[PDB]
Write a protein that binds this ligand. Sequence first.
Ligand SMILES: Cc1cccc2cccc(/C=C/CC(=O)O)c12
Length: 267
Amino acid sequence: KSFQTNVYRMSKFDTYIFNNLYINDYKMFWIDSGIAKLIDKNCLVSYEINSSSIILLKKNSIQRFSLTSLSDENINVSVITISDSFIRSLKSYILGDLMIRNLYSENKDLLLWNCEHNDIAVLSEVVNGFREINYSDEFLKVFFSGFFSKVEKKYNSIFITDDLDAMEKISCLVKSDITRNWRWADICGELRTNRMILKKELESRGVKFRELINSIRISYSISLMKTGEFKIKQIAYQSGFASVSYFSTVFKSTMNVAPSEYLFMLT
Ligand SMILES: Cc1cccc2cccc(/C=C/CC(=O)O)c12
């Protein structure tokens, strides 16, 4: 209930490409074997990852990156999405060393951690739905809080962001009424904050207002598909779009696949 997991297949030189992918909850992913090339267009860097490389994606970030297989054998990419309720049950473990956390920055939204075998084992059983070694809530809180702490320490940057951060307020507001016809005036009035102030959250992420709203609605539609909802026409309108055609165009530009192709990837 605290984790949502998926496994995707990559064949030889296959490439997943994401543009303006809004991260609605903390995510992490890794490959099970072989070598892959990760190109991060936000940080203008590229590097190779292996079966020990764990990639962390920060909540409320807007991602622009590609992942390419460099291996002959088929690669499985495992993606874990961590629920906000679980993340908040961690706020007592992290923040328990808080004024050392005050000296951190907040630029990095895509982090890399080279882990050992036991980390992969715990994370793999999470993706397996806890069907073999089940874990207690205490073990998982200690494991994940310790994991985030040492990755934050490595980059000297905040990963678990605070609840009163401006982009979190904007995101939670849009997600609480996804079909509302959002405009700048609605955000300013609900947050009682000047547009000169809120616009910094969009500029530092490289998005206009419509692309921000569109990106949140796309990640909303992805959560809907993950529940087993299969009717694309329903998903388009449930996510707040005005037409199936516009939803599919925005989805394709974000995910590089048509909505129906991703829905089948989830099975
Ligand atoms: C994040 C990621 C990383 C690497 C490979 C991937 C392959 C397919 C889909 C996704 C993301 C799917 C949306 C989500 O899970 O919220 C993916």
